[PDB]
Structures are given as structure tokens and as C-alpha cells.
Amino acid sequence: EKHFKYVILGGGVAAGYAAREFAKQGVKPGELAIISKEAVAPYERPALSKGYLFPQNAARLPGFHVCVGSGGERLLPEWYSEKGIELILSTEIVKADLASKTLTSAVGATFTYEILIIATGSSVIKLSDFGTQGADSNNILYLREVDDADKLVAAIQAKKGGKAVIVGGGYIGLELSAALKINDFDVTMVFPEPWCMPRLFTADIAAFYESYYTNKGVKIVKGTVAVGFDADANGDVTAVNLKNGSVLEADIVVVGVGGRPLTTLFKGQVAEEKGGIKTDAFFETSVPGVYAVGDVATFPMKMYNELRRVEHVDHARKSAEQAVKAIKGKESGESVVEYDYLPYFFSRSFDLGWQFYGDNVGDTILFGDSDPTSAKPKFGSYWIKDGKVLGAFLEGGSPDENKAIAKVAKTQPPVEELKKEGLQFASKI
Ligand SMILES: Cc1cc2nc3c(=O)[nH]c(=O)nc-3n(C[C@H](O)[C@H](O)[C@H](O)COP(=O)(O)OP(=O)(O)OC[C@H]3O[C@@H](n4cnc5c(N)ncnc54)[C@H](O)[C@@H]3O)c2cc1C
Ligand SMILES: NC(=O)c1ccc[n+]([C@@H]2O[C@H](COP(=O)([O-])OP(=O)(O)OC[C@H]3O[C@@H](n4cnc5c(N)ncnc54)[C@H](O)[C@@H]3O)[C@@H](O)[C@H]2O)c1
Ligand SMILES: O=C1O[C@H]([C@H](O)CO)C(O)=C1O
């Protein structure tokens, strides 16, 4: 049975960033462990949908260990041992007893803590979860962890020049459709909503990305879902059957239909809200000494006076740091500031890249141009509620422009004629 003062459960983004902050905060050898089911030390998960998939000069471990994704120092396994931070890899925790402060691995082993950080991230939703016919076929692929990414790269090699079907029109769909096309596949994206990224993109924004993709030769089939798959005698996928009776031939299927917080270890033991583990502004759960960070946390979003859960990397990094600051604060007597999060989302594909800051509520307007025949296109939007700008999006911004939209979102300036020189508005705030 192992004993640690601090245990981080999960070896992902939030775990690595927590490890960095513990080290900044003076953690001593033998005090901290990170327990992860993965076989590798924490890494910047966003690379798996982007650089990992380049057909040459691809990202690979140990390159994109944390914290290189935010311009930080890289934490190789050897950083952890030299600091006496125990990485316990290839270890899945299958039970957590918060009353006894003990965790039990799949293999029977046991681990105790005085302070626990839950950083278990999200599951990948799978068509097999739905019981979809033929969803067990080979080369139907998901992307959450580096092991999944390796399987996809291997399929991309095995099936080169063939046909790929991307199921889903969220972040994964967007990024992976682009990656497959760059890898020389005939690519078709299939999704049920009226335009891609329906939660964040407006119809205007979505139409830009759809036309851009179309121009790159990506086929887009809207208004339907996969209801079945054909497989060959070896059980490899050969076609995707759609709700509307169409069939798409496929050598590879990539599915991105959402993720859900991995919180079932704690079912009944902590308070839960909006699908995640409820926390305060310090990431502390119902149970004292038990924190929850990253994708699992439902936490108070100061600037919008609501609880929220966020499933993006910037929050994973920041929430991790905050927890460690709160823990360390309590040891010498806090105060620590409440988490004050400004939402930051972003995606890049092909030669495109956008950022969004704030909250996408209220009425929207589009500025700039907007032309999918490029180059490089530069256009944005503002979300306006109660006479204030609450949210801002920009595709193709320089660093000063991106900064300027972030400042709009953080300061919520009043407005009416923005559309006029939209970007200039941000540049003058
Ligand atoms: C492929 C991909 C690309 C993405 N790209 C972007 C992007 O470009 N921008 C952006 O904003 N967001 C992106 N995201 C979202 C972002 O990566 C997440 O918000 C972030 O990883 C959350 O970090 P976290 O540590 O909560 O969880 P995760 O990094 O998932 O870490 C969870 C860790 O806990 C381990 N775990 C879970 N249960 C157990 C257990 N029982 N025992 C031991 N270990 C366990 C997992 O294996 C993992 O190591 C991306 C996500 C994916 C999947
Ligand atoms: N740049 C980024 O921020 C980025 C990039 C990659 C992954 N991710 C994260 O990774 C996780 C997984 O992403 P995702 O794209 O899978 O989730 P997502 O929630 O961003 O979107 C999933 C999409 O799946 C579709 N959907 C739901 N059921 C479906 C079905 N039966 N058939 C077809 N489509 C269906 C909807 O169009 C929805 O838009 C999320 O937490 C996401 O935030 C983030
Ligand atoms: O935040 C990120 O982490 C990775 C970095 O580029 C990894 O260095 C990535 O691709 C991002 O968008």
C-alpha cells in the first residue's frame, strides 16, 4: 500500500500542469504522486488532432509533453524522478473510497492520500455505446489518447489513398476531416446538425468553414447519422449506412460525437451538477481535501454568475494551477483569489485558425472578409447582449488583433454601428 500526501488521479493536461505548479510551490521528494492509466507522462492532448497527424515532421512523444503547449518548460519523465514526484503509469484506478482516502488499482494495489486532485478528464463517446449495428468493425476509430492516435496513424498508412468518413461536426470532426484530407484521403463528413460546430458557430461563420472545406474537396453530408456499417469477411469496415438510406464507402471511419466527464469513480461520494463534480472557486469538491480540475469540474464562473463546466485545454491548465495554489494556500493559511475565468476557445485546420473569447449570447454581427477563396481570410464576429459586447470571434487574427478581441470580451464595452469597422473597434478599446 502506497502513501502520499498529494495524489493527482489522471495523467493528462491538468495533471502535468498541477505537477508544474506543485514544483513552483516547493513540493518535496516523496510527497506527490500522479496515477495514470496511460503509459506516458502527461502531454499536451491538443497535439493529437493536429501535429500528430502531419504526414511529415509530425509531433511525437516526448516532444509534446507538457508544458510545451503554452510555451512552458518540457516535463520529461526524468523531471518527475529528479523532483521525487512519483509517476505511477499504466495503472487504472477502479475504486476510490473518499471516506478512507484510499484508491485501488485494477490489479488490487492500493494508494492513500491526504489531498486528492481528481483530473480524470473525459471519456470519448463511442457508437458501440449506442449499440449501433456493426460499430465493432475494425478501422472505426476514436481519438482521445496517444494510444488512439497511434492506431489512427497506422490506419492512415495502411489505407493510403483510400476513403475516409468522419462522423460528427464538432471539434473532432472539423480537425480530423482536415487531417485526413492532408493525408491524401477522399474525405466525407457526416453530421446531424444544420451547420458544423452548432454550439459556437453562427450560420454565417459556419457557412464560411463549410465552403472552405468544400473547396478543399471535403464532401459534407448534413442532416443525418450513421445507423450501421458493413464489414468484410475480416470484419474491417467497408461502408457507412446512413439514416437517410444512403451508403458511403469507407476504408477508415473516424468518429467524434462528444465526450463526457469521467466521474463514475465518485458517484454518490461528491455533489455533482451539470454532469460534472461540483466545486467552489478553489476547485475544492463537497469533500474536504478533494479537488476536481479540468474537464470534470463544474465550477462558479465569476464573470457570468453561473456554474459551468468547460472541456477545453486553457481551463485545464489554469484550473490545475489554481487548485495547487489553493491547497498550498490552506497549508500556510490562505488567502487565494477566486478563479476568474475568461473563456478562451480555438481551433486550427488547413491554413485556418480562429479564437473566441467570452460568451456567445445575444445578437451577432459579422465583420471583415469572409471569402473562402482566401488568402489568408480574416473575419470575425461580436455577440451583443444588453448593449454590451459579450463575446468575440476572429479568424485569421495577428497576435495584437487576438489580444484586442480578448480585451473586448473581458471588458464588455457598450455599443450601434460596429459592423462599420468591426476589427478597428477592438483595436481601439
Ligand atoms: C484529441 C483532442 C484534441 C483536443 N484539442 C483541443 C484544442 O485544440 N484546444 C482546446 O481548447 N481543447 C482541446 N481538447 C480538449 C482538451 O485536451 C481537454 O480539455 C484537456 O485534455 C482536459 O485535461 P484534463 O487533464 O481534464 O483531462 P485529460 O487530459 O483527458 O486527462 C485525463 C487523464 O486521467 C487518466 N484517467 C482517467 N481515469 C483514470 C483512472 N481511473 N485511472 C488512472 N487514470 C485515469 C486519463 O487516461 C488521462 O491521462 C482536445 C481534446 C482531444 C481529445
Ligand atoms: N480545438 C478544440 O477545442 C478541440 C479539438 C478537438 C477535440 N476537442 C474536445 O474533445 C472532446 C471531443 O470532441 P468532439 O468533437 O467529439 O465533441 P463535441 O462536443 O465538440 O461535438 C460532437 C459533435 O457530434 C455531433 N453528434 C452527436 N451525436 C451524433 C451522432 N450520433 N452522429 C453524428 N454526430 C453526432 C454533433 O454535431 C456535435 O457537434 C470535446 O471535449 C472537445 O471539446 C476540442
Ligand atoms: O494547446 C496546444 O497544445 C498543442 C501544442 O502545439 C503542443 O506543443 C497544440 O497543438 C495546441 O493547440
Author numbering: 4 to 418, 422 to 435
Give sentences copied directly from the paper behind this entry.
MDHAR reduces the monodehydroascorbate (MDHA) radical to AsA at the expense of an NAD(P)H molecule, with NADH being the preferred donor. We report, for the first time, the crystal structure of MDHAR of O. sativa L. japonica (OsMDHAR) to understand its detailed mechanism. Structural comparison of OsMDHAR to other proteins, using the DALI server, indicated that it has the same fold as that of putidaredoxin reductase (Pdr), biphenyl dioxygenase (BphA4)18 and rubredoxin reductase (RdxR).
We observed an interpretable electron density map, suitable for ISD fitting. Superimposed structures of OsMDHAR-AsA and OsMDHAR-ISD complexes showed distinct binding conformations for both substrate ligands. In detail, ISD did not fit perfectly into the binding site of AsA. In addition, we observed clear electron density for the di-hydroxyfuranone part of ISD, but not its di-hydroxyethyl part. Nevertheless, ISD is hydrogen bonded to the conserved Arg320, which is within an accessible distance for electron transfer from the Tyr349 residue. The Arg320 residue forms hydrogen bonds with both AsA and ISD in the complex structures. Given the structural and functional analysis, we conclude that the binding site of OsMDHAR may be able to accommodate variable substrate compositions including MDHA.
